[PDB]
Write a protein that holds these residues in place. Structure first.
Motif, PDB file in Angstrom:
ATOM      1  N   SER A   9       0.793  -1.218   0.000  1.00  0.00           N
ATOM      2  CA  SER A   9       0.000   0.000   0.000  1.00  0.00           C
ATOM      3  C   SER A   9       0.849   1.305   0.000  1.00  0.00           C
ATOM      4  N   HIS A  10       2.121   1.247   0.433  1.00  0.00           N
ATOM      5  CA  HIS A  10       2.965   2.440   0.382  1.00  0.00           C
ATOM      6  C   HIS A  10       3.223   2.908  -1.030  1.00  0.00           C
ATOM      7  N   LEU A  11       3.204   1.967  -1.987  1.00  0.00           N
ATOM      8  CA  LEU A  11       3.330   2.393  -3.382  1.00  0.00           C
ATOM      9  C   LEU A  11       2.128   3.225  -3.843  1.00  0.00           C
TER      10      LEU A  11
ATOM     11  N   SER E   9       0.046  -2.492  11.339  1.00  0.00           N
ATOM     12  CA  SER E   9      -1.040  -1.532  11.226  1.00  0.00           C
ATOM     13  C   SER E   9      -1.909  -1.712   9.947  1.00  0.00           C
ATOM     14  N   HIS E  10      -1.383  -2.365   8.895  1.00  0.00           N
ATOM     15  CA  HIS E  10      -2.198  -2.609   7.706  1.00  0.00           C
ATOM     16  C   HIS E  10      -3.370  -3.521   7.981  1.00  0.00           C
ATOM     17  N   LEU E  11      -3.217  -4.410   8.976  1.00  0.00           N
ATOM     18  CA  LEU E  11      -4.368  -5.231   9.356  1.00  0.00           C
ATOM     19  C   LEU E  11      -5.501  -4.393   9.958  1.00  0.00           C
TER      20      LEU E  11
ATOM     21  N   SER I   9       7.745   4.696   6.888  1.00  0.00           N
ATOM     22  CA  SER I   9       6.742   5.709   7.169  1.00  0.00           C
ATOM     23  C   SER I   9       5.961   5.472   8.495  1.00  0.00           C
ATOM     24  N   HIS I  10       5.927   4.230   9.010  1.00  0.00           N
ATOM     25  CA  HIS I  10       5.259   3.988  10.289  1.00  0.00           C
ATOM     26  C   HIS I  10       5.933   4.696  11.439  1.00  0.00           C
ATOM     27  N   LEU I  11       7.252   4.919  11.317  1.00  0.00           N
ATOM     28  CA  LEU I  11       7.921   5.707  12.353  1.00  0.00           C
ATOM     29  C   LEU I  11       7.436   7.161  12.376  1.00  0.00           C
TER      30      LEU I  11
END
Ligand code: CL
Ligand code: CL
Ligand code: ZN
Ligand code: ZN
Lengths: 30, 21, 30, 21, 30, 30, 21, 21, 30, 30, 21, 21
Positions: A9-11, E9-11, I9-11
């Motif tokens: 999903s980051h893409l 967190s994607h879950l 990016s989660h950081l």
């Protein structure tokens, strides 16, 4: 700008930011 | 393709821009 | 499932979820 | 389009599949 | 819909989209 | 820390951050 | 509930721990 | 459980739906 | 609060939640 | 590229994208 | 600052580079 | 540093708080 390492999903988030109102297409293999 | 390149290696914003409509 | 408002990056994260390997096309302009 | 259907209005996950390839 | 590979967190994002106003519970092992 | 408005997917991302392995329950209906 | 406490109003990270298991 | 299954293998939206309230 | 395992990016999302209106600085190696 | 509204966590996700290894400083207070 | 430039108003990815280190 | 620690090992919210302005 810096080079990117983007999975999942980051893409799609990056494409979103990059393309703005133009939109984009997401087309993975297979 | 781009989806795999950005994940297994690296990609630039300029390469991503090619996928805008 | 449900219906909610999905906007911006949240809309494209939902398209990624739903379409996945099929891929998808985000065209806000219609 | 997708914005009007899903952001301005409200859409299901099934309607969202309308925009898959 | 397509099958999913979701970590961290994607879950929780996926559960959010799936459940809507019903909400959900997130219960990892251990 | 701080207090901010946390809504939608941002609220559940915050719950994931704060609760982690404990898990959590997102019940918008109350 | 959580929406009123944290979205409609404003909440701390500590209040958010109220909804952990 | 679901948290681990979706991450170490794969899971469906239909399996996720079981965790809604 | 629980300990965190945060990459990419989660950081930045976690720093965002933690710091609120104070803001923050993101400073990776190299 | 484009210009859009970038707010909150979306703003810092964009800064992460654009700055990456350089790092960045998010100071809402200015 | 960044909020006024990019959230309240509208900014490009290039303006966002103003806040890199 | 913190960026690497949180990713290769673990970190706490209290350690993250040190990077607020
Ligand atoms: Cl939002
Ligand atoms: Cl990830
Ligand atoms: Zn991720
Ligand atoms: Zn958002």
């Amino acid at each position: 700008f810096v080079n990117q390492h983007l999975c999942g999903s980051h893409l799609v988030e990056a494409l979103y930011l990059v393309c703005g109102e133009r939109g984009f297409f997401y087309t993975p293999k297979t | 393709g781009i989806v795999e390149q950005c994940c297994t290696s690296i990609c630039s914003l300029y390469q991503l821009e090619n996928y805008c409509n």
